[PDB]
């Protein structure tokens with residue numbers, strides 16, 4: 403593939419296996435990438451629109467911010483951005499074209515449909531590690547995400563109680579390194595502050611917030627945000643919030659030479675928690691300076707963005723909303739991994755959105771499946787392909803065991819019932835066999851074979867993933883769920899042996915094995931990931947676990963009828 407898919411692509415059926423024109427005037431971040439690809443004469447022209455190197459191609463460069471033209475043929479290679487970030491993006495597409503020292507002959511004109519695209523590290527729970535964030539930034543660069551908003555709810559220097567204090571030295575030098583890596587990867591590091599729970603609407607707190615921003619600025623930070631989500635009391639006043647942000651804008655963002663994004667998260671950040679008899683959102687829309695972004699999570703705390711939904715907000719805030727999409731964040735279903743495809747967001751509303759960022763799981767590597775897909779969606783939503791992008795994400799993250807990770811992820815998709823009413827499809831490949839088998843049973847051999855095949859594949863996938871060393875941090879994240887997933891598949895297998903139950907003693911051996919396996923699952927659920935909120939480890943919960951639990955109860959019923967016995971048919 404190419405990921406995100408370019409706006410315009412023309413491929414000829416020739417392949418190609420140098421002089422460098424523009425290396426001293428082009429984006430050094432792009433030139434570095436080219437040289438890193440070029441350990442190894444025909445022209446390579448690199449530059450931004452305006453540079454001498456690419457004058458001949460200025461009609462070909464899209465007149466869009468972050469746009470670029472890329473051309474490969476026998477004679478020469480052109481890598482020409484509308485601006486510095488666009489040249490870097492040309493190189494990111496170039497890097498994907500180059501397979502085994504060879505290139506296809508291609509012409510591409512590309513640019514993003516959504517202006518700001520990325521990740522908000524904005525969840526409750528253990529914030530990502532420094533090394534996880536370093537890896538994230540590089541991944542964002544490769545996938546043309548230009549935005550990283552730093553706002554972990556549990557960072558005491560971001561929120562309660564120490565938002566007024568500078569970071570200690572160790573954390574500051576870490577943030578400084580994050581900013582430098584972000585810069586090198588063309589990502590805006592957006593430092594967010596979350597003051598609303600205890601802010602006073604006086605000059606002293608106003609001044610402390612600006613002094614904090616100044617210290618962040620000294621660490622290299624050039625984009626800023628103020629979050630007013632999940633607070634009560636005086637900090638919720640929209641007139642004062644807008645005055646404060648307008649003051650930050652006028653006294654700081656319009657005084658520095660180089661500040662990029664200024665963003666706020668509103669107290670009412672979704673439709674369903676908006677007071678319909680209040681004027682909160684219209685006050686912000688009317689009073690907030692027009693260059694300041696306003697975030698929005700959709701119709702509900704957790705939701706996908708619809709045309710009607712984006713219309714409702716935009717009418718009120720008098721600008722296109724900056725989407726905070728609450729997926730794959732799992733901080734309210736901490737016992738689940740959410741590794742499914744990214745879907746449900748309207749692909750025709752790019753013009754109606756200023757930005758689109760994903761709030762991910764506290765599991766940084768595992769979040770890359772969704773992050774890669776959100777990158778692809780936000781760059782070219784018109785051509786967003788849910789399932790193919792999901793597969794592409796997985797192959798990128800774990801090429802040495804991609805089919806095994808697809809298997810594990812297909813069955814670790816749903817959230818289970820939760821206080822936000824948000825669910826995802828899961829296990830749809832086997833859901834037909836599951837329902838056709840179980841209805842008959844309470845059956846087509848092809849359906850029994852599908853179930854059998856599925857359990858066998860789950861075990862192969864679990865054992866290969868456990869021992870994979872290509873992405874150790876990913877495996878460390880998911881290991882407890884992989885163990886539980888393997889136990890699930892073993893239990894399925896033993897239940898299907900009970901169905902095929904040949905004699906009474908064999909059936910009783912299977913029955914005792916199933917009970918032992920239930921106990922081990924309970925053990926894992928009681929000893930791994932024992933967080934205060936949703937402790938434990940749940941996996942394959944939507945389709946698979948219920949099919950096994952129900953089939954077990956059904957076969958046992960059937961056994962007790964047959965032998966006038968009283969075996970326990972419970973499943974919990």
Ligand SMILES: CC(=O)N[C@H]1c2[nH]c(C(=O)Nc3ccccc3)c[n+]2[C@H](CO)[C@@H](O)[C@@H]1O
Nearest residue numbers: 524525526555631632671703728731733734
């Ligand atoms: C803008 C936003 O979603 N803010 C926070 C947030 N807040 C909530 C709430 O559910 N907040 C809430 C809802 C109703 C009543 C009080 C607080 C969910 N989330 C996200 C998902 O858990 C959480 O990660 C995030 O930091």
